[PDB]
Design a protein around this ligand. Structure first.
Ligand code: ADP
Lengths: 121, 44, 49, 48, 68
């Protein structure tokens, strides 16, 4: 079980960006691209709700650094209480786990494509 | 927080600005290979 | 003798290509190198698809 | 401390294309150079 | 020619000014064969042939505009 509302992507985003400082090397920029990609889903939720994606993402990132509670997320219904526990929003973890696997493993095949041969219909 | 303030309309200019940046960066990519002493000439 | 045309007999049927000269065997080399051009970047674990 | 400051962060990174292109056209790795550029340009005021 | 650079000083040197005889299929001295070429012809040829190759090696992209 996990709690939705953009709280899962923000929690997993800061964990990847923290490892980028320890590893460094040539892959330091690889963890940054994966961390910025996870934040796109919470920022997309703020676009359809007419919010500021910058102010919303900065609040979620500052909350996870101050406290360890991962239940803070984006509210598109605007009932207040960014805590997902009070809003009851719940998502399956098996669903959110496949979102990262299907997105990462598909981009691995796309980036390997060099010569593109397309026949005429 | 939602449903209030204003809602954005005519979002095509948001796509027009993207189409203008992508088309301008595509031109800057061909000239980019000519930058610096290692650049190459462009025959037209 | 059956006509004023008197056509000239061609050894091979119309549509047959030519050969010999210079570069006929070279044409076969450039055909294999061009096919090799696609398979070269696919070599190695860092290669492409 | 403003949204204008967040734009200036992208303005500084946009100027890095010139030294990045110099390494790409010369065959050298751009990140390996920029990693040395950031360290040397911190102490040195100029000419690096 | 490979033995001409290593021919070393002491005329007995020789090893140079030799070329191909296409009629007889042998290597003979070009001085006695009566074949000579101006020196300036070699200087202007190598410089002109290089400028043609330098201009081509420097072209990354060819742009062809259709006529109006
Ligand atoms: N009422 C809600 N409150 C907070 N977040 C929500 C709500 N409904 C959906 N979401 C978030 O929006 C995301 C997309 O949900 P939705 O578009 O309804 O289905 P799907 O997950 O198949 O795209 C989910 O990850 C969820 O966290």
């Amino acid at each position: 079980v996990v709690y939705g509302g953009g709280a899962a992507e923000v929690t997993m985003s800061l964990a990847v960006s923290e490892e980028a400082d320890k590893q460094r090397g040539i892959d330091q920029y690889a963890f940054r691209g994966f961390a910025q990609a996870l934040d796109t889903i919470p920022m997309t939720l703020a676009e359809n709700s007419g919010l500021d994606p910058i102010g919303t993402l900065s609040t979620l990132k500052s909350k996870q650094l101050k406290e360890k509670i991962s239940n803070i997320g984006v509210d598109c219904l605007g009932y207040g209480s960014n805590d997902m526990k009070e809003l009851f929003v719940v998502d399956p973890f098996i669903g959110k786990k496949q979102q990262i696997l299907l997105a990462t493993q598909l981009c691995r095949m796309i980036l390997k494509i060099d010569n593109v041969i397309i026949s005429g219909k | 927080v939602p449903s209030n303030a204003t809602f954005k309309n005519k979002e095509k200019p948001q796509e027009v600005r993207k189409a203008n940046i992508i088309a301008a960066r595509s031109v800057a990519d061909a000239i980019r290979t000519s930058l610096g002493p290692k650049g190459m000439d462009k025959m037209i | 003798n059956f006509g004023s045309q008197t056509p000239t007999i061609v050894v091979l049927k119309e549509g047959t290509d030519a050969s010999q000269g210079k570069g006929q065997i070279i044409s076969n080399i450039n055909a294999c190198v061009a096919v090799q051009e696609a398979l070269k970047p696919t070599l190695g674990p860092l290669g492409s698809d | 401390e403003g949204v204008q400051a967040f734009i200036w962060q992208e303005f500084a990174s946009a100027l890095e294309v010139i030294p990045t292109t110099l390494a790409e056209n010369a065959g050298l790795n751009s990140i390996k150079v920029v990693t040395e550029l950031r360290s040397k340009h911190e102490n040195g005021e100029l000419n690096d | 020619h490979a033995a001409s650079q290593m021919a070393k000083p002491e005329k007995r040197r020789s090893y140079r000014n030799y070329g191909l005889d296409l009629i007889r299929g042998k290597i003979v001295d070009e001085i006695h064969a009566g074949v000579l070429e101006p020196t300036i012809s070699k200087v202007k040829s190598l410089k002109s042939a290089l400028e043609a190759c330098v201009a081509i090696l420097r072209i990354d992209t060819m742009i062809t505009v259709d006529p109006e």
